[PDB]
Amino acid sequence: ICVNENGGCEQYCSDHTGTKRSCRCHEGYSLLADGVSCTPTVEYPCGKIPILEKR
Amino acid sequence: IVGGKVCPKGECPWQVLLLVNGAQLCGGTLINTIWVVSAAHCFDKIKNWRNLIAVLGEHDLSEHDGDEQSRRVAQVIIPSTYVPGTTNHDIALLRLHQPVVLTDHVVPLCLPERTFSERTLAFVRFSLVSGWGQLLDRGATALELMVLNVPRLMTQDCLQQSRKVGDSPNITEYMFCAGYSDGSKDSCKGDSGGPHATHYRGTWYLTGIVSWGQGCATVGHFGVYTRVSQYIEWLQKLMRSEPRPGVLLRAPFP
């Protein structure tokens, strides 16, 4: 399920026993209730450009 | 970087400039406040391990604007499988003496999970390569940080699409091809250790490291980058490890 279109996840993907899928995020991000989206929890999360984000 | 453009100040915030005795040495990628990912071949000629400096927030080499942060390289960790004078397993993980302070100009690049890197990031065509290396073959290095977008190529296509030059190293499972064969666009020896960064759903990740190639933007030859996905577990275990006395440390691989 994860092998196909990142399993719907924005970031990380874990396959479970059966038709179960768990999306996860890199440290400095929290997962949203949609269970796919990652939102920053910090001022400078990795992979984001502050001059471009603050624009 | 040959055929690229100037990376606007603050737009490559993870880029590291590695200095040895105040002189330009290599690039690197900040992955958190205390760790930098570079290439092992950068340290092949180092005698003065105490004179290694990493510069974050750098853009223009001729001017200090106050956004630069220098840190002594406390440790250089190289895989046991890396043989000096060769191309395979060309990765190094550096521990900075004290953390960097995250600012608009100093931001880490995301080190991805093996799973996501292999099954998702490996299929994003275009990724950005950067450094203050040569702007041309046998030409001058950049004063301002340059960036170039390069297409990733499958190894079989990379072998088929390249001019069969003898004595050339083999492209391994710990490396990949990216760039162009027309001699117009590449990264070169001065960009070594620098990032090959990949965009996926509004976040950039580390997928490769400026490693090796033929000359500099040579016709019929692509650029070769370390396949970072093979080193995730290796980097993570070490990032969780206590510092050892000495600058150069050789760690088992895998």
Ligand SMILES: CC(=O)Nc1ccc(S(=O)(=O)C(C)C)c([C@H]2CCCN2C(=O)[C@H](Nc2ccc3c(N)nccc3c2)c2ccccc2)c1
């Ligand atoms: C094997 C070996 O020559 N080892 C080695 C160890 C140390 C050193 S060094 O001491 O100066 C160090 C401080 C950089 C060097 C320096 C000096 C000689 C060349 N060099 C490089 O780094 C070359 N790098 C690149 C990188 C990306 C390339 C690309 N995308 N396209 C085209 C060519 C590209 C070349 C390079 C070319 C071929 C193999 C490896 C690196 C080499």
Ligand SMILES: [Ca+2]
């Ligand atoms: Ca400067």
